[PDB]
C-alpha cells in the first residue's frame, strides 16, 4: 500500500487496540517520524480525517491533531514533539514539525487547559527538562506569555525558589541553552521577589529555608546561594 494508506491503518490500529502506556509512549514517536518524513502528508491525512465522520473542525490540522491525541495520550504527544525536533529550522522536516506542534497547541487552547495542565503534560520528572528550549518554547506557545510560563513552572515546583534556581542553574549548563531566555526567567524570579521588597538577608533566608529538608531534586549549595543574594542585593535596593 501507499504511505498514506499504511499510516492511516496504523493510526486506526493503535487507537483501536488500547495498548500499554509505555507501548504508546514508544509508538507515538515512530508515527511522528513517519509523519514528517515527506512534506505532503500532514495536509493530506488532515484532509482525510477532516472528511471522516465525527466532530467538525475548523481546519485539517485540527482534525489530525485531535486524532493523534485520541490515538496517543496528551503525555505521548508532548513527548514525541519534544523528542522529534529536527536540526535545521528551514528544512522541510522543520516545517512539518512546526505544523504538528502548532496544531497541538491550538487544540489544547481550544480545550481550555490551564498553564498547570500544560506543565504537567510536558512534565518528565527531571526538573531541568522544563528549561530545555525544545520544551520551553512549546510551553510558551501553549501559554502565550513567558511570564505565565515561568509562573506555571514555579508553581509546579510548589512555589519553591530553591528548586527553581537549582533547575535554572542546571539549565545554564546546557550546550544549546538560550542564555537570554534563561536569564529572563531568572530576572522574572528576581522581580517577583522585588515586588515583595524583601530585605537582602531576609531574601537569603527566604531562599535558604527551602534549602532545609521540608520536601527528590538536586538542592543548591551555599556558594551560589550567596551569589544569588549578591545578585539581588544592589539591583533592586
Amino acid at each position: 500500500p501507499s504511505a498514506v494508506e499504511a499510516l492511516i491503518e496504523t493510526i486506526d490500529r493503535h487507537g483501536r487496540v488500547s495498548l500499554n502506556d509505555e507501548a504508546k509512549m514508544k509508538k507515538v514517536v515512530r508515527t511522528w517520524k513517519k509523519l514528517i518524513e515527506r512534506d505532503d502528508l500532514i495536509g493530506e491525512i488532515g484532509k482525510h480525517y477532516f472528511e471522516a465522520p465525527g466532530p467538525l473542525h475548523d481546519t485539517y490540522d485540527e482534525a489530525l491533531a485531535t486524532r493523534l491525541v485520541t490515538t496517543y495520550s496528551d503525555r505521548g504527544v508532548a513527548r514525541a514533539i519534544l523528542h522529534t525536533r529536527p536540526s535545521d529550522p528551514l528544512s522541510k522536516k522543520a516545517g512539518q514539525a512546526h505544523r504538528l506542534e502548532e496544531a497541538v497547541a491550538s487544540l489544547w487552547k481550544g480545550r481550555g487547559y490551564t498553564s498547570d495542565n500544560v506543565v504537567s503534560s510536558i512534565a518528565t520528572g527531571h526538573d531541568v527538562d522544563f528549561f530545555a528550549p525544545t520544551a520551553f518554547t512549546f510551553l510558551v506557545k501553549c501559554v502565550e506569555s513567558e511570564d505565565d510560563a515561568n509562573n506555571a513552572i514555579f508553581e509546579y515546583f510548589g512555589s519553591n525558589p530553591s528548586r527553581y534556581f537549582s533547575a535554572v542553574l542546571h539549565a545554564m549548563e546546557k550546550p544549546d541553552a538560550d542564555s537570554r531566555v534563561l536569564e529572563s526567567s531568572k530576572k522574572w524570579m528576581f522581580q517577583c521577589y522585588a515586588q515583595k521588597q524583601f530585605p537582602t538577608p531576609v531574601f537569603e533566608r527566604t531562599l535558604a529555608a527551602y534549602q532545609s529538608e521540608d520536601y527528590h531534586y538536586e538542592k543548591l549549595s551555599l556558594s551560589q546561594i550567596e551569589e544569588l543574594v549578591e545578585e539581588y542585593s544592589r539591583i533592586y535596593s
Binding site: 488500547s18 495536509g43 485539517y60 528551514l90 481550555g112 487547559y113 495542565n117 550546550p175 538560550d178
Partner: protein, 1112 residues
C-alpha cells in the same frame, strides 16, 4: 552414558562386504556418522576380544542378514553378544533383511537354515541354545526388506536417514539461536528472491562492514540450499584473492576451481579454462552464495552471465561497494539495515550477560555502552564480549577507556575497507570524520572543492557504504568516524606537493601546540570541544609567538569562559577558510583578524556587539550564520560581499536595524530573521537579488518593509506575527510561491495585487489578520488554491466576485468575520467541500453559491431566510443553523437541516422540531429562560445544555443509537427526567449535575477498585457505570475526557475482556460535581467475582473519584 562408536554393523563378509555394506558405509560417512570399521582394528591384538569390547561400546548395532549368515561362527557370536548387550545395557538394534525373509530365520529352515544346521554340527548345547534364542528374537525385530525396495540406493538412503534421525544428531544448527531478529531480513529477502520465477536472477547484499552480510548469507544458505540440485557457499572471497593481482587469469582460474570443487562434489578438480563452469552448470538448478566480493574480476571468474546456470538458479553476492553490483548489472539489491534499538540491546545483552536481558543494576551502564557502540552488530558483539565477566565498578571505570580508544577488532576490520580506497577518497574520508561530519553537501563542495573532486568522492564513498547522505547532509557512523579520528594522527594529507594533518581532540590535543619542535604549518584543521571547564587551557608563551595557517576551525566553546590565548592563537592565522565558533563569549572579533579569505562564518551563540567596527574585504564569502547572538546591536558594511548566498540572523533579538549595504548582496537567496523583537525597518534589497526564502516570523516591532522584491524565485515568504506592519512589498511573478502566511499579522490594510500572480500557491492563510479592509480583485487568478483560511478577520466588508474563477478550493473557513455583509452570488464552485461562516454577525443573506457543498455551518449569523434553490444541492452531510423564530416558513429547509442552536433567551418550546427528519444534534447555548423539552425527533446522536436555569421535565422517549446527553449545569431536573438521563441505553457517555453517586448503583467504592458479585450461571452481562471526579483546580471549561476500563478476577487472574474497553469524547465538559455514566459488556463466564478498574487517560487533567456500577 559413554559410547566409543555410534553404529556397529554385523554382517557376513563373504556376501555383503563387497557389494552393499560398502555403499551403506559410504552413505554413513556422508551424514556425519562414525561407524565402527573392523578393517581399522590395530594389528597384533586379539580380534575376538577387541571386537567384543567394541560391541558393548556401540550405541546402535545394525545386523545385515544374508543366506549364509549362519555359515560363520563370528556372525553368530557377535549377534548373541549384540542381543545380550541390548537386553542388558539398552543399545538399539536395527535389522536389514537383505534377500532373506525373517520367517525362515527363526525356523532355521531352508535358506540360512541349511547353513545353521551345517555350522551347529560341532558345538555344545549352550552355544546352540544361545544362538537359536538370539536368532529368533532378532527375527522378531521389524527392520527393512531388500525385496520391498525397487532400487538399492533409496533403501540405503532411508536406512542412513533413519539412523541419523534416531541418533538425535541434531543436524539443524543451534548456533542460529543466539542471533536476533533475522526474520525481518529473511522476509525482506524472500521478496527479492522469488524462487518460483524459474529465472537465473542475481541478487546483491550490500551494507557497511559489520552489519551482518556474512551471517545473513549463512542463515539464508542453511534455510534454502536444500531446495536446489547443487548448492555452494564461498566465504571471504576478498581475503583470499591476491592484493596486487599480478596475474589475473591464474587467480580467476583458481577461484573458479574452488567454486567448482565445492559446488560439484568433485573433491579435486584442476580447471584448464574459465569456461568449465558454463559448460557444466548449463542445465541445473543452482544456489550459489559469494561473500565479500571486492572487485569485478571475482565476479567474472565465478558468475559472468546468467546463461552459466540453469533455470531457477539463484546466486547471491554480498559486498560493500555498490559499484561492483551496478557494473555487473544486478538491479536486485537488498540494502541491509541496522537493527532496532531493542534488537540492538538484545544482541549486546546476549554477548555481554549471556541472556537477552541485563543483570540487575546494569541497565543504565549497559545502555551507555550500547549507545557508544553505535548500532553495528559487530560493535555490539565486540563491546559485549569485552565486558562479559566484569563487575559493575569495572564497567563504570572501563567505559572511559572504551570512549577514548577504538577496539582493535573493530579497528582492523574497518582498516581493511579503508585501505581499498583511492588516495583522494582517503583524504575526503578523513576530512569528513574530522570536521565536516554532519554538514551540507554543498558547503563541503564549496570548502574542499579546490583541493579535490568532492562530488565524485562523495558519490564513491556512498557507493562504498562509508557515508550516507540523507537530505543533503552527509552522515558517518559513530564507530567509523571514531576510527577516522585516530588515523588523523598517524596519517598525513598530500594535496599538491605539500603535506598536512588535522587536530581533532576534546582537550587533550593542545599540548602538541606546545611542542614548539615540529612544523605547525601542516595543521589546516582544528576541531575542539571545550565543554569541560571554564579554566583557561595551558599554552606556552612561545607557542603564542608562532603564527599558524589554520584554514578550517570548528570550536564548540561551550562554557561561560573566555579564551584569550585561543583567540590570540587562531585569529593570527593569515587565511582562514571557514570559521565556526559556538558560544564565543566575547564582545568583538579582534581587529588583527584578516578576513579576505573567508567562505563560511558561523557563530551559533555569541555575545558580539558591532563586530569588526569597520569596512573589510568580504570578497569571497558565501555563508553568514549569526544565530541566537542575543547581545548584538549592529552589523558591518556588507559592501563587497557580492558572493554572499545565505544570511541567517536567527533569533538575535537585540539587532535594532539592518544596514543599507544589503543592497550590494546581489546573490543573496536566504534572509532569516525568525525572532527580531527590536527591528524597525527592512531596507530595499535591489534588482538582481532574487531572494528565495524570506523568513520574518515574529518581528513584533518591524514597521516598514521594502516596496518591491523582484521575487522571481521566492519559494517561501513568512510573516507570521509581525503585529505592526502597514503595507506589504509588491511581487513581480512569484511563479513558485510554495508558502505564504500572515497568521495574526494585524494592522495590515491591503494586499499587493500581484498576489494573484502566484499560480501554484495551493494553501493560503490570513487567520487573525484583523484590520484588513478588502481582499484584492486579483484573488481569482491563483489556480490550485485549495485551502483558504480567514478567521476573525473583522473589517473585511466584502468578498471579490472573481472567486468563482478559483475552481479548486475545497474549504473556505471564514470564522468570526464580524463585519462581512455580502457574498458573491453568481458563482458555481465546481469542487467546494465546506463553508464555515460562524458568528458572521452581519452576514444577513443566505450564502448562495450553487455548489456541491457538503458541510455548511451558519451559526451566529443574521440570515433569517432560506432559498428554494437548495433542493438542487444533492448531498449535505452537515448543515447547521442558529435557530430563529421564522423557520416554520421554510419546510424545504426542515428535512435538510442537521443541527440547531437555541439562543440565550427563548421562552418557546418548539414542538414542530419533531417534524424535521434528520436532526443529528441539538444545542441549547444557554436558554436561561426555558422549562421543558418536546418529543425530539427519532434520529439524535447529540444533545447539549450548558448553563440553563430550568429543564424540569425532559419529555422525550428517544431510542436511536449511541446518544450523548450532556447537561453541564442544570440542577432543576425532575427525578423522572434525571432517571431517564441515567436509565437510557446508549453506547456513549452521559453527564448530569449530581453531588454523589445515585443509590441506583449499589456496588460502590472510592485506579480505584470496584468489587462486586453476580447472580447468573452463564450469560453475557451488561453493566451501567457511574463516576465522579476528584475535586481539584480543574479549569472552568475543560472540554475533553477519555476513560479506560480493566476488569479482572480474584479467584483466577484471567484478564476478562470488555468490548467497550474505552469511552472517549472531545467535547464533554470536565467539571467537579457531576455524574458521568456509561455502559459495558462482559462475556467471559467467570461466575462470582469481578473486579473493575476505571482509569482516566490524561491523569494530569482528570482523575476519577467516587465510583459505582450496576448490573442489568
Amino acid at each position: 552414558r559413554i559410547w566409543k562408536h555410534q553404529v556397529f554393523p554385523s554382517f557376513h563378509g563373504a556376501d555383503v562386504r563387497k557389494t552393499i555394506l560398502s555403499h551403506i558405509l559410504e552413505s554413513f560417512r556422508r551424514k556425519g556418522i562414525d561407524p565402527f570399521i573392523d578393517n581399522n582394528i590395530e594389528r597384533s591384538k586379539s580380534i575376538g576380544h577387541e571386537l567384543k569390547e567394541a560391541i558393548k561400546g556401540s550405541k546402535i548395532a545394525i545386523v545385515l542378514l544374508s543366506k549364509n549368515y549362519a555359515s560363520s561362527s563370528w556372525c553368530l557370536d557377535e549377534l548373541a553378544e549384540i542381543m545380550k548387550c541390548r537386553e542388558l545395557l539398552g543399545q538399539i538394534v536395527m535389522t536389514i533383511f537383505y534377500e532373506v525373509d525373517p520367517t525362515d530365520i527363526k525356523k532355521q529352515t531352508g535358506e540360512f537354515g541349511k547353513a545353521f544346521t551345517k555350522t551347529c554340527k560341532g558345538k555344545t548345547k549352550e552355544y546352540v541354545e544361545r544362538w537359536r534364542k538370539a536368532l529368533e528374537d532378532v527375527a522378531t525385530i521389524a527392520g527393512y526388506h531388500s525385496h520391498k525396495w525397487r532400487n538399492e540406493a533409496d533403501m540405503i538412503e532411508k536406512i542412513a536417514t533413519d539412523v541419523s534421525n534416531m541418533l538425535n544428531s541434531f543436524k539443524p544448527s543451534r548456533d542460529f539461536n543466539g542471533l536476533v531478529g533475522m526474520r525481518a531480513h529473511m522476509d525482506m529477502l524472500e521478496q527479492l528472491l522469488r524462487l518460483v520465477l524459474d529465472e537465473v536472477r542475481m541478487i546483491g547484499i550490500w551494507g557497511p562492514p559489520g552489519i551482518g552480510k556474512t551471517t545473513i548469507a549463512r542463515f539464508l544458505f542453511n534455510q534454502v540450499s536444500d531446495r536446489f540440485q547443487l548448492s555452494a557457499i564461498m566465504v571471504n572471497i576478498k581475503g583470499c584473492y591476491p592484493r596486487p593481482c599480478f596475474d589475473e587469469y591464474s587467480a580467476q582460474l583458481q577461484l573458479q576451481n574452488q567454486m567448482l570443487s565445492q559446488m560439484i562434489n568433485h573433491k579435486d578438480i584442476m580447471i584448464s579454462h574459465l569456461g568449465v563452469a558454463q559448460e557444466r552448470l548449463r542445465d541445473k538448478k543452482v544456489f550459489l552464495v559469494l561473500d565479500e566480493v571486492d572487485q569485478l574480476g571475482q565476479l567474472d571468474a565465478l558468475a559472468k552471465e546468467t546463461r552459466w546456470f540453469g533455470p531457477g538458479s539463484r546466486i547471491i553476492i554480498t559486498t560493500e561497494d555498490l559499484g561492483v553490483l551496478k557494473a555487473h548489472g544486478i538491479n536486485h539489491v537488498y540494502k541491509v539495515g541496522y537493527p532496532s534499538n531493542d534488537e540492538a540491546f538484545q544482541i549486546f545483552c546476549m554477548n555481554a550477560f549471556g541472556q537477552k536481558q541485563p543483570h540487575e543494576g546494569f541497565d543504565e551502564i549497559a545502555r551507555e555502552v550500547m549507545a557508544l557502540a553505535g548500532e553495528l552488530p559487530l560493535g555490539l558483539k565486540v563491546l559485549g564480549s569485552a565486558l562479559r565477566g566484569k563487575s559493575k565498578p569495572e564497567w563504570e571505570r572501563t567505559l572511559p577507556r572504551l570512549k577514548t580508544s577504538l577496539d582493535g577488532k573493530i579497528g582492523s576490520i574497518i582498516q581493511f575497507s579503508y585501505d581499498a580506497l583511492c588516495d583522494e577518497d582517503k583524504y575526503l574520508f578523513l576530512y569528513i570524520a574530522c570536521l565536516f561530519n554532519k554538514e551540507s553537501t554543498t558547503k563541503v563542495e564549496g570548502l574542499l572543492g579546490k583541493f579535490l573532486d568532492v562530488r565524485q568522492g562523495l558519490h564513491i564513498l556512498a557507493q562504498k557504504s562509508l557515508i550516507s547522505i540523507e537530505d543533503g547532509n552527509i552522515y558517518m557512523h559513530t564507530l567509523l568516524e571514531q576510527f577516522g579520528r585516530e588515523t588523523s594522527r598517524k596519517q598525513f594529507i598530500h594535496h599538491g606537493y605539500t603535506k598536512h594533518q588535522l587536530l581533532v581532540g576534546e582537550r587533550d590535543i593542545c599540548e602538541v601546540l606546545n611542542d614548539d619542535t615540529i612544523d605547525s604549518r601542516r595543521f589546516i584543521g582544528i576541531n575542539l570541544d571545550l565543554y569541560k571547564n571554564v579554566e583557561e587551557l595551558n599554552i606556552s608563551e612561545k607557542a603564542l609567538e608562532r603564527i599558524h595557517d589554520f584554514q578550517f576551525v570548528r570550536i564548540n566553546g561551550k562554557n561561560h569562559a573566555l579564551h584569550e590565548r585561543l583567540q590570540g592563537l587562531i585569529y593570527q592565522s593569515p587565511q582562514i577558510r571557514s570559521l565556526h565558533w559556538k558560544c564565543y563569549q566575547n564582545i568583538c572579533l579582534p581587529s588583527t583578524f584578516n578576513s579576505e579569505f573567508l567562505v563560511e562564518l558561523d557563530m551559533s551563540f555569541s555575545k558580539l556587539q558591532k563586530l569588526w567596527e569597520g569596512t573589510k574585504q568580504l570578497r569571497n564569502l558565501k555563508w553568514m550564520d549569526l544565530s541566537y547572538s542575543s547581545y548584538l546591536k549592529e552589523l558591518p558594511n556588507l559592501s563587497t560581499a557580492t558572493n554572499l548566498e545565505e544570511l541567517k540572523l536567527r533569533n538575535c533579538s537585540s539587532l535594532v536595524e539592518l544596514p543599507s549595504s544589503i543592497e550590494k548582496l546581489t546573490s543573496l537567496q536566504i534572509l532569516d530573521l525568525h525572532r527580531c523583537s527590536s527591528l524597525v525597518e527592512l531596507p530595499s534589497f535591489g534588482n538582481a537579488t532574487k531572494l528565495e526564502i524570506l523568513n520574518l516570523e515574529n518581528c513584533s516591532s518591524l514597521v516598514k518593509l521594502p516596496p518591491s522584491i523582484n521575487a522571481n524565485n521566492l519559494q517561501e515568504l513568512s510573516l507570521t506575527n509581525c503585529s505592526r506592519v502597514v503595507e506589504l512589498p509588491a511581487i513581480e511573478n512569484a511563479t513558485n510561491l510554495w508558502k505564504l502566511n500572515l497568521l495574526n499579522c494585524s494592522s495590515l490594510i491591503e494586499l499587493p495585487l500581484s498576489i494573484g500572480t502566484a499560480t501554484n500557491l495551493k494553501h493560503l492563510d490570513f487567520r487573525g489578520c484583523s484590520s484588513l479592509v478588502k481582499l484584492p480583485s486579483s484573488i481569482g487568478d491563483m489556480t490550485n488554491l485549495e485551502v483558504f483560511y480567514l478567521s476573525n478577520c473583522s473589517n473585511l466588508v466584502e468578498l471579490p466576485s472573481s472567486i468563482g474563477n478559483l475552481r479548486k478550493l475545497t474549504l473556505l473557513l471564514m470564522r468570526g468575520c464580524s463585519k462581512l455583509e455580502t457574498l458573491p452570488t453568481n458563482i458555481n464552485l465546481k469542487s467546494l467541500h465546506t463553508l464555515n461562516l460562524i458568528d458572521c454577525s452581519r452576514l444577513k443573506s443566505f450564502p448562495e453559491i450553487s455548489t456541491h457543498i457538503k458541510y455548511l455551518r451558519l451559526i451566529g449569523t443574521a440570515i433569517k431566510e432560506v432559498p428554494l434553490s437548495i433542493m438542487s444541492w444533492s448531498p449535505l452531510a452537515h448543515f447547521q443553523i442558529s435557530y430563529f423564530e421564522s423557520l416554520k416558513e421554510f419546510p424545504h429547509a426542515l428535512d435538510i437541516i442537521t443541527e440547531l442552536q437555541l439562543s440565550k433567551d427563548i421562552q418557546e418550546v418548539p414542538p414542530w422540531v419533531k417534524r424535521m427528519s434528520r436532526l443529528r444534534a441539538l444545542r441549547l447555548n444557554n436558554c436561561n429562560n426555558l422549562v421543558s423539552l418536546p418529543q425530539l425527533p427519532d434520529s439524535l446522536a447529540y444533545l447539549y445544555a450548558d448553563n440553563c436555569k430550568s429543564l424540569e421535565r425532559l419529555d422525550c422517549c428517544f431510542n436511536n443509537p449511541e446518544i450523548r446527553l450532556y447537561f453541564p449545569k442544570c440542577f432543576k431536573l425532575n427525578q423522572e427526567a434525571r432517571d431517564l438521563i441515567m436509565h437510557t441505553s446508549t453506547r456513549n457517555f452521559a453527564m448530569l449535575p449530581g453531588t454523589q453517586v445515585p443509590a441506583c448503583f449499589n456496588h460502590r467504592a472510592t485506579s480505584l477498585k470496584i468489587k462486586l458479585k453476580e447472580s447468573p450461571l452463564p450469560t453475557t452481562l451488561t453493566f451501567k457505570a457511574c463516576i465522579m471526579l476528584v475535586n481539584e483546580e480543574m479549569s472552568y471549561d475543560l472540554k475533553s475526557m477519555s476513560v479506560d476500563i480493566v476488569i479482572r478476577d480474584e479467584q483466577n487472574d484471567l484478564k476478562v475482556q470488555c468490548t467497550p474497553s474505552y469511552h472517549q469524547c472531545t467535547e464533554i465538559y470536565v467539571l467537579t460535581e457531576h455524574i458521568y455514566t456509561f455502559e459495558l459488556e462482559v462475556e467471559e463466564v467467570t461466575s462470582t467475582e469481578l473486579v473493575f478498574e476505571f482509569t482516566s487517560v490524561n491523569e494530569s487533567i482528570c482523575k476519577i473519584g467516587e465510583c459505582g456500577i450496576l448490573q442489568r
